[PDB]
């Protein structure tokens, strides 16, 4: 299976789309927030509104391909326009899970992996993203204040749409 954008046109290596909701009524496009103590917004989570894409995501994979499929593992990367000041230093803001908590998290680029560890699968009529430690669904966990956490949920993905940001 091919992976598409909303318009029809196949993934590109290294394009940036918004990850947006396949579905309505919970939630917009993936972007950050700040959670619990954390005075920088490093937890990847879905936009309370409906009405917002979230932040542009940088996909992509070491070998020199035009296009990705469902097996090439997937460093994502968010390029906002305004960081915040604390992700002003980062050069990417690329997406890890911490284990412990099962949480996609900003990771430290001294952390980050040549090969993510990510991929984009068919889900339905739509998409679904997972992460391979076998792979596992990312799908959304709210916490105590009601951010709609995206986390390791095997069984219960969120599905998703990408969007080409312009």
Not at 31 to 47: F, H, M, R, W
Not at 52 to 71: D, H, N
Not at 122 to 136: A, G, I, N, T, W
Request: charged share 30%; glycine share 8%; net charge negative.
């Amino acid at each position: 299976k091919e992976l598409l954008d909303a318009d029809g046109d196949i993934l590109r290596n290294g394009g940036t789309y918004y990850i947006v909701p396949a579905f309505r009524g919970k939630g917009g496009g993936l972007t950050l927030a700040k959670i619990g103590d954390e005075s920088c917004p490093l937890n990847v989570v879905q936009a309370e509104s409906e009405t917002k894409r979230g932040l542009p995501a940088m996909i992509w994979t070491p070998p020199r391909i035009a296009i990705l499929t469902p097996a090439f593992y997937l460093n994502i990367e968010f390029q906002p326009r305004d960081p915040p000041a604390c992700l002003q230093k980062y050069g990417r803001l690329s997406w890890k899970v911490e284990g412990e908590s099962q949480e996609v998290k900003i990771a430290p680029a001294s952390e980050q992996h040549l090969f993510g560890s990510f991929k984009i699968e068919p889900y339905r009529d739509d998409y679904k993203l997972v992460y391979c430690e076998s792979c596992k669904d990312l799908g959304i966990s709210i916490d105590d204040e009601n951010n709609r956490l995206l986390v390791v949920k095997d069984g219960d993905p969120l599905a998703v749409r990408f969007e080409k940001s312009k």
